[PDB]
């Protein structure tokens, strides 16, 4: 049987440095305030998400 190892001789911390991160996404629809419709835009002036 043939195994395979990859060792970070510099420092064990680099074993995690390379596979670092894990920032899962958590966005959701920003319902508009006027008609409560699913927002499709973002007014550059107000920054408020609107749909109509």
């Amino acid at each position: 049987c043939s195994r395979t190892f990859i060792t970070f001789s510099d420092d064990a911390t680099f074993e995690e440095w390379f596979p670092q991160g894990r920032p899962p996404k958590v966005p959701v629809r920003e319902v508009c305030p006027v008609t409560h419709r699913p927002a499709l835009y973002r007014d550059p002036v107000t920054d408020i998400p609107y749909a109509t």
Binding site: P33, P44, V45, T46, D47, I48
Partner: peptide, 27 residues
């Protein structure tokens, strides 16, 4: 639909408009 007829160009020659400055915080 938007051929930009002649007179529209003559009218656009008016002085320009000022830019906005958006910094609102509310619902």
């Amino acid at each position: 639909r938007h051929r930009l007829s002649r007179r529209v160009l003559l009218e656009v020659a008016t002085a320009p408009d000022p830019p906005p400055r958006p910094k609102p915080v509310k619902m």
